Amino acid sequence: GRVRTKTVKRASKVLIERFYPKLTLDFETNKRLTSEIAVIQSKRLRNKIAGYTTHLMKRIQKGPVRGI
Amino acid sequence: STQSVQTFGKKKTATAVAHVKAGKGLIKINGSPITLVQPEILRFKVYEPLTLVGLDKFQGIDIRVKVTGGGHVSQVYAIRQAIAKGLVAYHQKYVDEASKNELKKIFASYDKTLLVADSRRMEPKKFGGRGARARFQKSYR
Amino acid sequence: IDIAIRHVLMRQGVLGIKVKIMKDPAANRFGPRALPDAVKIAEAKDEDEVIPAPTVK
Amino acid sequence: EGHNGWVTSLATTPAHPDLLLSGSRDKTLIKWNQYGIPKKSFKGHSHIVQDVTISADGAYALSASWDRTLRLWDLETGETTQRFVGHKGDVLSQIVSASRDKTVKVWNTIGECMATLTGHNDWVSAVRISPSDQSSTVISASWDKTVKSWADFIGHTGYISCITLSPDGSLCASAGKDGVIILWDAEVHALAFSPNRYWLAAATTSGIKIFDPEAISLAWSADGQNLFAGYTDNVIRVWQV
Amino acid sequence: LQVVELATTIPLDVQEAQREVKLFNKWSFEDVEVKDVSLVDYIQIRNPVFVSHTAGKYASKRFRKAQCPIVERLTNSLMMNGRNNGKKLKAVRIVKHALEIIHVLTEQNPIQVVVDAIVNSGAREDSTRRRQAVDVSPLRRVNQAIALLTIGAREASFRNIKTIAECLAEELINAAKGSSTSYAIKKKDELERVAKSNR
Amino acid sequence: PVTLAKVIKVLGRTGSRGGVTQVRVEFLEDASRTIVRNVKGPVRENDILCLMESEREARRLR
Amino acid sequence: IHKIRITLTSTKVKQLENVSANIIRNAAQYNIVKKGPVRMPTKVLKITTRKTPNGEGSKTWDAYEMRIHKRVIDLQAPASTVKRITQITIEPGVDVEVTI
Amino acid sequence: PGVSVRDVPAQDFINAYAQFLQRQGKLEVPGYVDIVKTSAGNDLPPQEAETWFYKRAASIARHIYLRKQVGVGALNKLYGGAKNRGFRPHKHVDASGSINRKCVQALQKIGVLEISPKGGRRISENGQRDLDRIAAQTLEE
RNA sequence: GAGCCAGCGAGUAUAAGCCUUGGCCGAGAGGUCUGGGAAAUCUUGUGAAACUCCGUCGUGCUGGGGAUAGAGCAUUGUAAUUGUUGCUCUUCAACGAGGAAUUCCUAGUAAGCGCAAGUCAUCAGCUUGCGUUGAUUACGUCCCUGCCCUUUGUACACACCG
RNA sequence: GCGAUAACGAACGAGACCUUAACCUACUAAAUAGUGCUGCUAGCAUUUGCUGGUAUAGUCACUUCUUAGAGGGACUAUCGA
């Protein structure tokens, strides 16, 4: 399966904590933003971080979630 | 240059490059008619870019193909896919985008290969076995 | 990682020595400068002092 | 209705009424139920096609894409004439240009950058040349709470999606992430003015507001009896008024 | 009704494929129906194809094979015996000679002949371990139908002057009528005859 | 005879090696006669199972 | 005006690309025409040898690869300039040779 | 609109050209065409043994016709098959060189093939016409 | 007989010689005279083999199968006898689908089919790769062989081969 | 991994990573790749056409095919449960 590891999850958590207003609900815009914010040294890792962040944002909209 | 498009078409390793320029209904394979290449059976796969849609899409266009690679079946599949791509690209840049949408709907309702090339490759052979997955026979005692 | 392996010729036999060093990627010049899973999200400079309708010229 | 994606771009021309160039994100901007009739599909874009507007001559089109190029097409023959290259970032707006490089570069008729005015700080957003005969000034906008114009229209509570201009070059409406529509002397995406009435037709995510799939382009028609806007559900939904 | 003469000539029969897709341009995929409804949703004859060679991806997904031409299914099932593996042109030649020879012998449509033979060559009772006899699934009944038909043909064609397509024809005729003169139909006797005792 | 029973819900794969699987069948003539049976081969919902008798119950086999 | 040809090969891609851009810059301070660079398909020298230093254990093999990249650029320029154009580019790891 | 060698099935084309060139009787059929064998990796002589050389000559002449500047080695490898090496596995083996050389030299003297620049034999100017006209008769039927 | 469709690679010069094209001889093996290539340049489109067509055979140990054996022609090598290998004629053996047992495999996969590279003066029924044709059947289970985690018992710890 | 928690914070392994296969008519260049055009030609037909051949000078154009560097592209994206 595709279970997200701890690196991508913690990266997404810190993105949401430290840049919440900038992040959006769109995977492509999130890609271009995570390119600017963090310094991942791989396209794949950057994409996984950004996409899981988009999923987290799309969850946060329906009420606060515990952990962020 | 008067009216021309350039499209390709592939299979296992067989590659077909099309040359669809304005013409008189001439449809050729390496310089030979669609009515024969080598085989006698699989001719209808390359007939499909015609019988599905009718011959009238080729009234004023002349097509040339330089298929090279793969094998007989692979070349046939690559040729017919390249013919479909060339016809679609001609309708795109010259004839009508609505026309090409109708044509590609016909193809995709018949065979996704006509527009979407098959992305299958021979998996590499691994040591400890003759094939990619096959193994040398094991002899317990 | 840089490895050096040597054969130490003792009186009773041969001893073997292996030395591995994991240098920090910061001092790496002609290559990667961090581990693949090292991520370097930075801080923010978002905070600032504003006012609804200013136009200074 | 033929877009496979999200219809983000719409523009009209006062030279060819009934001509609609609806954009999308699927590498193709298209010439235009039984009402909307497609005309031609423009092939040559690499990625998301942010916006396109028909040129003032009423013939060609100026396209922008997330692949760091401004694409200058030929409506009548379905060709591209020039490929502007040099913005190190996705472009999303002499011709002015805005991109993620945070820099505005000036392109001439053949296309060769000649002026490199700079001074923003975060992802200069949509920019438009003012249709003001009084002066050739431009009202630009960015994501650093800045709508500086070449006049600094700053002081926002966040980044701003885009800007729109009056048909005389006197009023600009700034709206987007800033829920309020600030205007000088929710999330909005496709606000634009009109050259014939007193309206504020926009395309906020929450809904349409005057004065679910989502419209990123809600351009006004030339005649003034249309407000169609292409949602992300692949259809533009013609609106009569 | 439509004259489209172009620079290169196209034969009369190939100018008969514009209005009906036909296997070898000789059989109609628009009249043949399946006797029983339990062997319908797992067979597709409402999609005629000129040849029994598409080489689709019918093993990728779970029920990706359900959407396979019965002609390709039978033709692929003839590619066995080992020395014949990966010889599909030979098999399509065999199946066209088949369709021909059945039509010379039968009065119905050989597509109908084979469809009936297959829907009547799938045993209903077979047993798993004594073996607790259970009722077989549709797709399985189908695939043993085709498998047994190809086997019967193959072992009839061993050490016999009657050629492979001829053995196939006789096996298909005997399994089409439902008579216990086909290799599959006698096995269709044995599977239930044993399976009933196993209950 | 051959009664026709359409499976509406899919159970687990019982049996020794797991080849067989339990199925719940219905009937287009005796509608409220849902009987649990077990199928040798692959199964889906709405797959009509042409049986040969419908007076026996299959629950779990070795 | 002559037909001086420059051909250069290496095992490292980045150093070769840097030195090729260097010769382009050196011919661009003057105005020597640049027909290339043209990129030959890379040579992969493959050696497959048995891991074990003896004959015991599971049959495992090592696939060693050496990769060779060749490039050609055609320069039309007086014979004097190409001499310095090449001999000032002595970047390590790239062996460069000059032929008319 | 005329017709050439590329518009015809190979089987009947080489059939007709071989039988016609036999009808002339001017091709120098070697005196060993009854004793010798076609290939070292062959086990029997041609069955139609009194006219097989004319078939081979027609096929070779067409093979040059479709190409340019081919030689004896290329044709030898073209006509070589798969040897039956016994208990050992199969392998491609080159065909007979003397037969092919004599065939192309006889085609030379009938003026059907010419000695091309820097290796090989092209087809002669008159050979093109001969093959094209002999192809035009079959397609009329 | 006719159609003649890939892909991975390798190659030398005062050699003791590399890939070898063309021309010419011999049935073939092979010989010789030139030419190209230190190679995306020539060998090489490696026109590979399975495969397609049209003919002979016609159910049989038969034109299936090609052991064993004699004669002859060459090639490599200082040296082929214990046949190095290649080619020609002749000899025409077992074997009619394999017992109890047992191996490998899920898609461009198995199986078929060749091809190149290593070993290499000569010799590939071998490996390492490569492509050509291209399937039936699952897409589940712990019955067998095993593996992982927890609970539990143990007089085991050389650890149940205790 | 979500979580549960007498733990808390860590480290190796796994994953990331690297090589390769698949996509790009969207950049950059090919006289050791190709496609055209244009010369000089040949067989058929004579409608300017169909098949080819040759010209690393024609002091031709270009990059679909092929090559290789710079990148882009999948993140399970959207939707229904």
UniProtKB/Swiss-Prot annotation, chain B:
The keyword NAD does not apply. PROSITE patterns: RIBOSOMAL_S9. Disulfide bonds: none annotated. One of its GO terms (cellular component) is cytosolic small ribosomal subunit. One of its GO terms (molecular function) is RNA binding. Coiled coil: none annotated. It holds the Pfam family Ribosomal_S9. It comes from the Eukaryota. Keywords: Ribonucleoprotein, Ribosomal protein. GO terms for biological process: maturation of SSU-rRNA from tricistronic rRNA transcript (SSU-rRNA, 5.8S rRNA, LSU-rRNA); translation. Belongs to the universal ribosomal protein uS9 family. This is Small ribosomal subunit protein uS9. The gene is RPS16.
Curated annotation (Swiss-Prot), chain D:
It is found in: Cytoplasm. Pfam families: WD40. Disulfide bonds: none annotated. Disruption phenotype: Causes defects in hyphal development under hypha-inducing conditions and attenuates virulence in a mouse model of systemic infection. SUPFAM superfamilies: WD40 repeat-like (SSF50978). Keywords: Cytoplasm, Repeat, Ribonucleoprotein, Ribosomal protein, WD repeat. One of its GO terms (molecular function) is protein kinase C binding. GO terms for biological process: cell adhesion; cellular response to neutral pH; cellular response to starvation; filamentous growth; filamentous growth of a population of unicellular organisms in response to biotic stimulus; filamentous growth of a population of unicellular organisms in response to neutral pH; filamentous growth of a population of unicellular organisms in response to starvation; G protein-coupled receptor signaling pathway. GO terms for cellular component: cytosol; cytosolic small ribosomal subunit; extracellular vesicle; nucleus. Gene3D superfamilies: YVTN repeat-like/Quinoprotein amine dehydrogenase. WD repeats lie at residues 2-35, 44-83, 86-118, 120-152, 155-185, 186-211, 212-241. Has antigenic properties. Elicits a specific immune response in systemic candidiasis human patients undergoing malignant hematological disorders. Belongs to the WD repeat G protein beta family. Ribosomal protein RACK1 subfamily. Component of the small ribosomal subunit. Mature ribosomes consist of a small (40S) and a large (60S) subunit. The 40S subunit contains about 32 different proteins and 1 molecule of RNA (18S). The 60S subunit contains 45 different proteins and 3 molecules of RNA (25S, 5.8S and 5S). Component of the ribosome, a large ribonucleoprotein complex responsible for the synthesis of proteins in the cell. The small ribosomal subunit (SSU) binds messenger RNAs (mRNAs) and translates the encoded message by selecting cognate aminoacyl-transfer RNA (tRNA) molecules. The large subunit (LSU) contains the ribosomal catalytic site termed the peptidyl transferase center (PTC), which catalyzes the formation of peptide bonds, thereby polymerizing the amino acids delivered by tRNAs into a polypeptide chain. This is Small ribosomal subunit protein RACK1. It comes from Candida albicans (strain SC5314 / ATCC MYA-2876) (Yeast).
